[PDB]
């Protein structure tokens, strides 16, 4: 499978890879930080049972 590095230049791809991973990681952390459930800077010391949960269906 290393023949793929005869098609694509490692110089171009490794920059594009690091860029994509850095952007994806940062997007996920800020999505979680904005949530109630995972606002870990304020609430990280709460136990799992104490952490927020979104509203269930009432079904009635």
Ligand X SMILES: CCCCCCCCCCCCCC(=O)OC[C@H](COP(=O)(O)OCC(O)COP(=O)(O)OC[C@@H](COC(=O)CCCCCCCCCCCCC)OC(=O)CCCCCCCCCCCCC)OC(=O)CCCCCCCCCCCCC
Ligand Y SMILES: COC(C)(C)C/C=C/C(C)=C/C=C/C(C)=C/C=C/C(C)=C/C=C\C=C(C)\C=C\C=C(C)\C=C\C=C(C)\C=C\CC(C)(C)OC
Ligand Z SMILES: COC(C)(C)C/C=C/C(C)=C/C=C/C(C=O)=C/C=C/C(C)=C/C=C/C=C(C)/C=C/C=C(\C)CC/C=C(C)/C=C/C=C(\C)C(=O)O
Binding residues for ligand X (CB under 6 A): 4, 8-9, 11-16, 18-20, 22-24, 27
Q: How far is CA 13 from CA 1, 26, 28, in A?
A: 15, 20, 22
Classified as helix, coil or strand, 54 is coil
Distance of closest approach, residue 4 Cβ to another protein, in angstroms:
8
Q: Least distance (Å) from another protein to the CB of residue 59?
A: 4
Identify the CA nearest to 36 among candidates 51, 57, 46: 51
Does position 1 interact with a copy of itself (CB under 8 A)? The reply is no
**Interface pick for ligand Z out of 26, 35, 43, 46 (rule CB under 6 A):** 26
């Amino acid at each position: 499978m290393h023949r793929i590095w005869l098609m694509y230049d490692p110089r171009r791809v490794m920059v594009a890879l690091v860029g994509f991973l850095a952007v994806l990681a940062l997007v996920i952390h800020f999505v979680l930080l904005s949530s109630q459930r995972y606002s870990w800077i304020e609430n990280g010391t709460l136990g799992a049972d104490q952490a927020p949960v979104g509203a269930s269906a009432p079904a009635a």
